[PDB]
Point group: D2
Chain length 123, copies 4
């Protein structure tokens, strides 16, 4: 039961800010602000997490999406982060991500960036 452990404000290694609420039902809702790329201000996110994780010391699996459209800009792209929450004194969300841009069929080979973000509760 990591609803309280997940909910809150998280920061990654780029200085991006992830503001999330975890629902009792497994939902993730909030906003993402990227420190880099074709982005400004906050963007909607949604996602899901395992609301009944294993009790053996394993992390808590979760994921979320941002489409990079808001009232300021549209980067015609979406990122998905997939990862796990690891609780404790220095809690962390360890993620890998896929960023797809909309492309023509001819350029679709080149549509998707992959990377990895680690989030902490301290900047």
């Amino acid at each position: 039961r990591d609803e309280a452990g997940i909910t809150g404000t998280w920061y990654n290694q780029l200085g991006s800010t992830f503001i999330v609420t975890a629902g009792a039902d497994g939902a993730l809702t909030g906003t993402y602000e990227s420190a880099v790329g074709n982005a400004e201000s906050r963007y909607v996110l949604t996602g899901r997490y395992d609301s009944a994780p294993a009790t053996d010391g394993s992390g808590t699996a979760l994921g979320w999406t941002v489409a990079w459209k808001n009232n300021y800009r549209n980067a015609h792209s979406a990122t998905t982060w997939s990862g796990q929450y690891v609780g404790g004194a220095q809690a962390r969300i360890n993620t890998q991500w896929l960023l797809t841009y909309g492309t023509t069929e001819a350029n679709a080979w080149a549509s998707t960036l992959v990377g990895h973000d680690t989030f902490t509760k301290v900047k």
Copy 2:
């Protein structure tokens, strides 16, 4: 404006079924049923898509998450698909995905599978 083009029932190459509604606001909601893996019946999904895509022939970026917990089972894992919708006679959603399982810190190197799913409106 691909709200009508996205909304509906989609099937991938594995015979999985993706049932989605696209909101005017960029939301994706629905259910996923996997034909493979530690899964049975339907699981909640949510996600986002570019509600104002480019008009140059590019695809429509989107993503969504499933956490693999429902009333039947809990696979302590989450998958994120990231991709684009390509409209037309044979419409398609072309995706890559990341499946993270909850692990101990010692096994976290091995936590994440990557793959690729192509969805069609016909089985």
Copy 3:
């Protein structure tokens, strides 16, 4: 023992041409010619494969790299394909790949594309 099954000329879905020799010792050597991207003519490749695969119907794991420098151009990038060879009437190499471009530290978040290529012995 898939040395004879791997060695030869392969083509992917983009119309790229992969010319490989598999060594008894697990080596892969040859040349790659991409139909797309910042590339022309042939580039050196090397890689490795499992020279003693399982006999249970499993595929044969393998991988290879291309750095995108030759006498014509230098795209300051390297792609790695990781996958498996599946023997038989319609033999295939099913791969996923990572293409890293050299970046400054500020842009390294955006350095790596991911995709998937399927190779056949017929175009």
Copy 4:
């Protein structure tokens, strides 16, 4: 020209040891010893790097493969790392990797793990 900067012994965050020689011609040769997984002792590697990188502060793209067969064991798998070398006082190779295991056609959806390794010249 990073031939001297790449050649040598590198260690990642898992305590794996990567011993590589960079050739003037773009080759990478050496041995890999994993601290984790179905592995013991050293395994052959080969790969490629950009021997004429940009002079603007960008990193040096490179990649390499290991098939996880040696005289001790065979894990019927191959990993490819794709990344860049970043020179200087605290030199680093920043990589993402794809590990494919040989599978039956029914389980091929689950064949490939993805992760990220950072190598340093100090443990």
